[PDB]
Paper text:
There are no structures for an invertebrate Ras protein in the protein databank. We expressed and purified Ras from the choanoflagellate S. rosetta. We crystallized Ras from the choanoflagellate S. rosetta, and determined structures bound to GDP and GTP at resolutions of 1.85 Å and 1.6 Å, respectively. The conformation of Switch II and helix α3 in S. rosetta Ras•GTP is very close to that of the T state structure of human Ras, suggesting that the balance between the R and T states of Ras•GTP may be altered in invertebrate Ras with respect to human Ras. The two conformational states have been denoted ‘R’ (assumed to be competent for GTP hydrolysis, although this has not been established definitively) and ‘T’ (assumed to be inactive in terms of GTP hydrolysis). S. rosetta Ras adopts the T state, similar to L120A, where Tyr 71 is rotated outwards and exposed. (B) Sequences of Ras from choanoflagellate (S. rosetta) and sponge (A. queenslandica) are 72% and 80% identical to human H-Ras, respectively. Variable Regions 1 and 4 in human H-Ras interact directly with SOS at the allosteric site, and are altered in S. rosetta Ras and in the ancestral sequence. In contrast, S. rosetta Ras is deficient in allosterically stimulating the activity of human SOS.
Author numbering: 1 to 167
C-alpha cells in the first residue's frame, strides 16, 4: 500500500503533539510534555485507498531547530501549526515554511496551514481571515483545528495526504 510521511511543525506549545495523538489514539493530551522528536504509524483508508501514515512530531522550541532540520528531511508533506490565541505563533509560520523549503531543496512542498486551539475563542487574537490570508499568500490550504474538541483533526492530516498525492 501507499506510505505517506507527514511532518508536524510549528512553534512550541501550539498543539502539535496533541493533534498527532488525537489522530493516532483518539484522546486529548492535557499535559504539556515538550517534544524533542517522536514518530507514529497508522494504517488508514483515505478516499477508499489503503494508506500507511508515518507521522513525525517535531520540536517547536527554538533551541532544537537543528534537530528539527534533520528529522524533517524525510518528510513528504508538512502540517504547519499555529494557535489562534498567539499572533506570534502565526508570525513564526513564515520561518517554518522557509526552513521546510530549504531542507527539501524545493520551491514548493506539500503543506497545509493549521490554526489550532480554535476552541479557545475567548483567547483568539488571530482571526480566521488572517490565517486564510497567510495560506493564500503561499497557495496552500488552510484549516482551523482543535485537538481538544476533535475538530478537523483527521481532515487536516488526510488533506495533507491529498496534497502529497498531487506533487
Ligand atoms: N484548549 C486547547 N489546548 C490544546 C489544544 N491542543 C493542544 N493543547 C494544549 O496545549 C499544550 C501544548 O500542547 P502540545 O501538543 O504539547 O504542544 P506542542 O506544539 O507539541 N509543543 P512542542 O513543540 O514543545 O513539543 C498542552 O497542555 C495541550 O493540552 C487545543 O486544540 N485546544
Ligand atoms: Mg510536542
Ligand atoms: Na518529556
Amino acid at each position: 500500500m501507499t506510505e505517506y510521511r507527514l511532518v508536524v511543525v510549528g512553534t512550541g506549545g501550539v498543539g502539535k503533539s496533541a493533534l498527532t495523538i488525537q489522530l493516532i489514539q483518539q484522546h486529548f493530551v492535557t499535559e504539556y510534555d515538550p517534544t524533542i522528536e517522536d514518530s507514529y504509524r497508522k494504517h488508514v483508508s483515505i478516499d477508499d485507498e489503503a494508506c500507511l501514515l508515518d507521522i513525525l512530531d517535531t520540536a517547536g522550541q527554538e533551541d532544537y531547530s537543528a534537530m528539527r532540520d534533520q528529522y524533517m528531511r524525510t518528510g513528504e508533506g508538512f502540517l504547519c501549526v499555529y494557535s489562534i490565541d498567539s499572533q506570534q505563533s502565526l508570525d513564526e509560520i513564515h520561518s517554518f515554511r522557509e526552513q521546510i523549503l530549504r531542507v527539501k531543496d524545493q520551491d514548493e512542498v506539500p503543506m497545509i496551514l493549521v490554526g489550532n486551539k480554535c476552541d479557545l475563542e475567548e483567547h483568539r487574537e488571530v482571526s480566521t481571515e488572517a490565517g486564510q490570508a497567510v495560506a493564500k499568500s503561499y497557495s496552500i490550504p488552510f484549516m482551523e483545528t482543535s485537538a481538544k474538541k476533535r475538530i478537523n483533526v483527521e481532515e487536516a492530516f488526510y488533506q495533507l495526504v491529498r496534497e502529497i498525492r498531487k506533487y
